Design a protein that fits this description.
Radius of gyration of chain A: 25 Å
Shape of chain A: elongated
PDB class: protein fibril
Structural class of chain A: mainly beta
Entry title: Structure of hIAPP-TF-type3
Strand content of chain A: 25-35%
Chains A and 11 copies: Islet amyloid polypeptide
Oligomer: homododecamer
Number of helices of chain A: 0
Number of strands of chain A: 3
Largest interface: A-B, 37 and 37 residues
Helix content of chain A: under 10%
Assembly: dodecameric
Keywords: hIAPP, amylin, protein fibril
Amino acid sequence: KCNTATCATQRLANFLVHSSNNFGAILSSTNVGSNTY
Amino acid sequence: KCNTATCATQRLANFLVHSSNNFGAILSSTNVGSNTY
Amino acid sequence: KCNTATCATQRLANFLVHSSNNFGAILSSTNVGSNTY
Amino acid sequence: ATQRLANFLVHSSNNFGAILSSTNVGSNTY
Amino acid sequence: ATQRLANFLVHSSNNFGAILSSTNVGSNTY
Amino acid sequence: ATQRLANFLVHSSNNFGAILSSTNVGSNTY
Amino acid sequence: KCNTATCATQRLANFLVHSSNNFGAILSSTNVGSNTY
Amino acid sequence: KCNTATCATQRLANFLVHSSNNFGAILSSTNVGSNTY
Amino acid sequence: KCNTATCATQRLANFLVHSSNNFGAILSSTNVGSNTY
Amino acid sequence: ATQRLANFLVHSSNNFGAILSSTNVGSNTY
Amino acid sequence: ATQRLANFLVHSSNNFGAILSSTNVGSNTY
Amino acid sequence: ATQRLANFLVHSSNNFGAILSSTNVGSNTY
């Protein structure tokens, strides 16, 4: 592959699995800047 | 492949699986800037 | 492929699977700037 | 058993220059 | 058993210059 | 058994220069 | 005037003189909300 | 005037003279909310 | 005036003279909220 | 004495949901 | 005396949810 | 006397939820 000189190689492979197998209630909220008077 | 000189190679492959196999209620909210008077 | 000099190569391949196999209610809201008087 | 009620109100206002007034009751600004 | 009610109100206002007034009751601004 | 009620109110205001007033009751600002 | 009882009296008289006997330039300005781009 | 009882009296008189006998330049400004870009 | 009882009296008189006999320049400014970019 | 210039630009954008964007360049709000 | 220039740019963006963005460059709010 | 230039840019961004962003460059708030 690189017989003589100057063979710089960066190897990388990414695997990403985000599994959300819900079976129940997920009651989420996000109040940003809201002002309940 | 690179017999003599100057063979710079960056390898990369991305896999991404976002599986959301819901079976129940997901009650979400987002109140940005809202003001309940 | 690159016998002599100056062979810069960037490899990349992307896989993306966003599977949302819902089986239930997804009650979502987004109140931006809304003001309930 | 006699009741007397009196209310004198003299609201006098004069302006000779400038007035800037702002009032945001239950108002917003984005 | 006699009741007397009186209300004197003299609301006098004079202007000789400029007035700027703003009022946003329950109003918004985007 | 006699009751007498009196209220004298003389609200006098004069301006000869500038006034800047701000009031944000229950208001927001983003 | 008030011989027996109950004589409440409020006295008041207002004098106001706003004399502006100008003899020279009065260069005034008022930029409210104006935006000079 | 008040020979027997209950004689409450409030006395008041106001004099106000605002004399501005200018003889020269009065260069005034008022930039409220103005934004010189 | 008040021979027998209950004679409450408040005396007051106001004099106010605001004389501004200018003979020269009065260079005034007021930058409220102004933003010179 | 040879010069070679190359520019490869692949600007790919995908949306599958909501986007709210605001931009006030040199603007004001009263 | 040979010069070679290359520029590879792959700007990829994906969205699957919500984005709220605000930008006030030289703006004001009263 | 040979010069070689190479620039490699892969700007990849993914979103699966919410993003709130604010930026006030030279902006005010009263």
